[PDB]
Amino acid sequence: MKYMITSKGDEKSDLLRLNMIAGFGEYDMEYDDVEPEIVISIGGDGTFLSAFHQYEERLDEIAFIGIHTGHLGFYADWRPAEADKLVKLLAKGEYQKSSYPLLKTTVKYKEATYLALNESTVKSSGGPFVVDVVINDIHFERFRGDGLCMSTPSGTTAYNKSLGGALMHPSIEAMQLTEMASINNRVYRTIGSPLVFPKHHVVSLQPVNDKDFQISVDHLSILHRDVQEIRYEVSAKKIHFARFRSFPFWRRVHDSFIE
Amino acid sequence: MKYMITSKGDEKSDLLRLNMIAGFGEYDMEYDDVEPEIVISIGGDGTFLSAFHQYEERLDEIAFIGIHTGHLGFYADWRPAEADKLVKLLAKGEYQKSSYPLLKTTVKYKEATYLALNESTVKSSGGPFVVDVVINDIHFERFRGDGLCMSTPSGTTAYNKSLGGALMHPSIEAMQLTEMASINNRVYRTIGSPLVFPKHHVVSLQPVNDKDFQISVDHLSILHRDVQEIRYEVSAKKIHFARFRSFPFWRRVHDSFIE
Amino acid sequence: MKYMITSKGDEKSDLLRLNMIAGFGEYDMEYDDVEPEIVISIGGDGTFLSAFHQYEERLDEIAFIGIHTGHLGFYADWRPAEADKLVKLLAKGEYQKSSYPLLKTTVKYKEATYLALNESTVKSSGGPFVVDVVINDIHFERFRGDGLCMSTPSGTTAYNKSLGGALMHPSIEAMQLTEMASINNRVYRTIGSPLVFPKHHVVSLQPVNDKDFQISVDHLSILHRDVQEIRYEVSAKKIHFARFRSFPFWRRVHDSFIE
Amino acid sequence: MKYMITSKGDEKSDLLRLNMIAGFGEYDMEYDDVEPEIVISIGGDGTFLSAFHQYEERLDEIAFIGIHTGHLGFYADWRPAEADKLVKLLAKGEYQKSSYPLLKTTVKYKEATYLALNESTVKSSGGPFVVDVVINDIHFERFRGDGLCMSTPSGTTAYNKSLGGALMHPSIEAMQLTEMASINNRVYRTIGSPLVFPKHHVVSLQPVNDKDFQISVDHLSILHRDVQEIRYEVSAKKIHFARFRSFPFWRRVHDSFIE
């Protein structure tokens, strides 16, 4: 089948990449980075995040696999020493697919949409951050603070976790909203707690005074000017992984945070 | 249809109860507190929790309704001044049913099972609290601290919230595990974060030294001796509510915590 | 004595300012905004913070007073309706002085020093934030995350509080370091907890890769390039307040956050 | 000088104890566990806490030293392999004394007072926990939740830390109040944040309905019945340590929590 390999770009990763291409040379596997069916990422979770965004127009046609050159990754499921075993399994087609939910972000000004695998965040462009938070058209809170983070399930181990969010098993189709440094006093009030939203709920952020926001989607971060609305919902699209063995989410969590 | 009414037992609640019984007297509604089809709770969420546990052997046959005499409740959806309107709607059958997930607790010694609408918690019987946390038979962490709290979705606004858990929309079939005062240092390590579990995941707590635990299920709290295992999973059973109008979960959250 | 009055600049504040100047006209009080001995701030705590930084070269010669036009302030101790009573008390000299500790920030490149009344914070200029935290020349932790906040005692009710810091009575000569969204996992480790430092302890932040930082001192926020060190210590300088009645810190905290 | 040695009571600790007694036999050092001037604890910080409470009537006459048999301790400053070096230094009198602040607890019914080296905590005897918190005779908050923890500076690394309190350098004469699982909503309000109190401030807890409380002082935990008041203040008494080398507090914190 058609495949391609992205590399973190250090010496370790490029050579492991060349090795796998040579190894794939011995099977009915065609290198194709335009219309690949398998996308192998070699590096860290940052490398995997870039591979996902490189091909996010064909998530329906692609199964992703990650090899972590440094520490273990939540998306890069494989060690370098296992590359040859992976080459053989992929060529023989002995793999199941699994899917993770994704987050849709819409920015209205006159409208851009993004897909996130980890999260989308909103901060001010320097001044104070104040937004109205509207859940399914109902005004829920006026948020004052440093910013807001909306995480997918697999994103819950990343920025969301540092903000006090829960870790959510990726079989749950949800998104999680966490606060960054909310102001709470006599007059200003936020919920405080993380909020977990099911599919089809729409969280809308609406400016109060300033209309300029620094918006991040995974690694990408852009200053958006004259914003009327930021809309969050669980995407209809999903990322697909090639899975060759059992590696449960909670085992990845244990291995990454406990030992 | 058959119905019964429990009362918080103060003067306000009993009289509102008597009024509704008189009001039901004018329809084809039979008072029956053995095999009721509708269970009306008048009081607070504590009163509603007691009504649920009174009839938890027939959750399949019952739709619950709550009237809050004091502050607004998350389960008691109705104000006293609306009692007469409620009498009329219930008698005419103009109601939809909605369901919330419940938590199953199994205590093995030689085995008791409980159903919780808010949460189940585990603490020691005085000494230090140490348990091994096993997720789907995989050892996840050795927890040291004051205790652990496993919450249903509708429970996430209660004890779970005070422990830093996320609020979860009740359409999500999940349970959430939060830490009470975990010890984390060079040698002792817990995840820290709340954990959200889908249906069919089994969280097992296993003693390390002491085998005596104070276990709570909603309001009930019992000292269990010589415990071998505490098992948590999302129940196959659900609570059913009679719904007569739109009152979204996030609106209940806003009304209860924001204003 | 010599005095001056700064105003938030809205209609309410300017007119209250003009009234007090007219009122001071009836005593031996000379308006002087170059070498004032009393500095009256009329507005909010933001207005007071600007008054403090306007005159921070003569904190030894000045007693500050604040009038809050909007909500109650932690530094603006007086309501508008009390302005005339304040005019009379100040002119008669019936006031005690009280002092709050201040934070000294040194940025080395080739060295700038700042004084903060609330706090100094450090964030990256966009990329990831990584710094080594050195306490009294001893390497304490490698911090990864969004940033760090060093608060005075009276600052503990502001940004520090939103970050989970403790509130500290201003009679304690200390500074408090809080984390913004620290990354903690198998490999990366921060203390997590706020840290409270006595006088004469020196906390030094040292770059790891990137040398560009966005540094804030109270309201001021500046991009510093090619930074070698950020040094925090409790200042030898203190702010002095004119006090005319009992208004305990914990009462200000109660009034501002509880009711 | 007069000295005594307490032991954790395992084989390692008793034998290390016997060795030091034999070693002390070669100097002008008299074993005396009634009126000792030096108290050596061999075990963990729990062993040291028991030694402190054994002799808390003569804290003015005693310098404490701790040897940790297991992991490093915050009070047990010495490893077993260094016992002989310690014997020699103590006998030669080559030691400085350092002092840590202590917490005074008064329980009024008709009045008991306790001294804590780590902290004092208050919980209910089973039902809900509700107390009024009075700071220097001013009503500050009505606390609802699981309990409250008042920590000394050296206690801030223990229970206080697990509750989200700040770590405080022990040269600061203060106590820190942290919340256990506070309920915060539309009607119920607590400060949330830890509170740091200077010397001479008096925090008083006063019952609201129930008068029975489980009160802990370091390891001791007792059910107090018919309580009228719990009073917290920084003690006039201090613990004195024999110090033979530099081991800064922040280095102990680094070694215990970072690596």
Ligand SMILES: NC(=O)c1ccc[n+]([C@@H]2O[C@H](COP(=O)([O-])OP(=O)(O)OC[C@H]3O[C@@H](n4cnc5c(N)ncnc54)[C@H](OP(=O)(O)O)[C@@H]3O)[C@@H](O)[C@H]2O)c1
């Ligand atoms: N305060 C924070 O915790 C914080 C702040 C900003 C951004 N981030 C994370 O950074 C991501 C994008 O940046 P980047 O990765 O391109 O560069 P980066 O900022 O250097 O990456 C931050 C770290 O997050 C790790 N990571 C990525 N996805 C993760 C996941 N799902 N669970 C746990 N850890 C994960 C990455 O692992 P590798 O080393 O294997 O790449 C990397 O070490 C965002 O999606 C966000 O989640 C975290």
Ligand SMILES: NC(=O)c1ccc[n+]([C@@H]2O[C@H](COP(=O)([O-])OP(=O)(O)OC[C@H]3O[C@@H](n4cnc5c(N)ncnc54)[C@H](OP(=O)(O)O)[C@@H]3O)[C@@H](O)[C@H]2O)c1
């Ligand atoms: N630290 C804590 O936050 C804490 C500690 C222990 C127990 N609890 C809660 O108490 C419950 C059982 O006690 P109880 O109600 O019989 O007596 P209780 O301890 O007096 O009740 C505690 C309060 O929780 C409220 N509550 C109940 N269910 C709730 C929900 N789903 N979301 C938000 N608030 C809710 C009750 O409202 P009403 O006043 O209307 O009854 C009551 O005010 C447990 O299920 C637990 O969630 C909370």
Ligand SMILES: NC(=O)c1ccc[n+]([C@@H]2O[C@H](COP(=O)([O-])OP(=O)(O)OC[C@H]3O[C@@H](n4cnc5c(N)ncnc54)[C@H](OP(=O)(O)O)[C@@H]3O)[C@@H](O)[C@H]2O)c1
């Ligand atoms: N996430 C946060 O909580 C956050 C983030 C950034 C900055 N800030 C605060 O903003 C300050 C400087 O900004 P600014 O005041 O010029 O404009 P600002 O960002 O609009 O001010 C933020 C708010 O903090 C209040 N405040 C100031 N000093 C305080 C104190 N000691 N305790 C409690 N609240 C206090 C101000 O009261 P007034 O309305 O009376 O002016 C204002 O409402 C910083 O010193 C920092 O503490 C807070």
Ligand SMILES: NC(=O)c1ccc[n+]([C@@H]2O[C@H](COP(=O)([O-])OP(=O)(O)OC[C@H]3O[C@@H](n4cnc5c(N)ncnc54)[C@H](OP(=O)(O)O)[C@@H]3O)[C@@H](O)[C@H]2O)c1
């Ligand atoms: N949730 C919690 O974190 C929690 C709950 C209850 C009690 N405690 C602590 O337990 C103490 C009394 O119990 P115990 O020690 O007799 O038995 P314990 O409950 O078994 O001791 C708990 C642990 O705390 C450690 N510790 C003691 N003082 C400390 C300090 N100042 N800083 C950091 N760690 C410290 C002890 O070290 P060693 O192993 O060397 O003895 C022990 O490992 C209390 O003073 C309280 O601070 C903690």
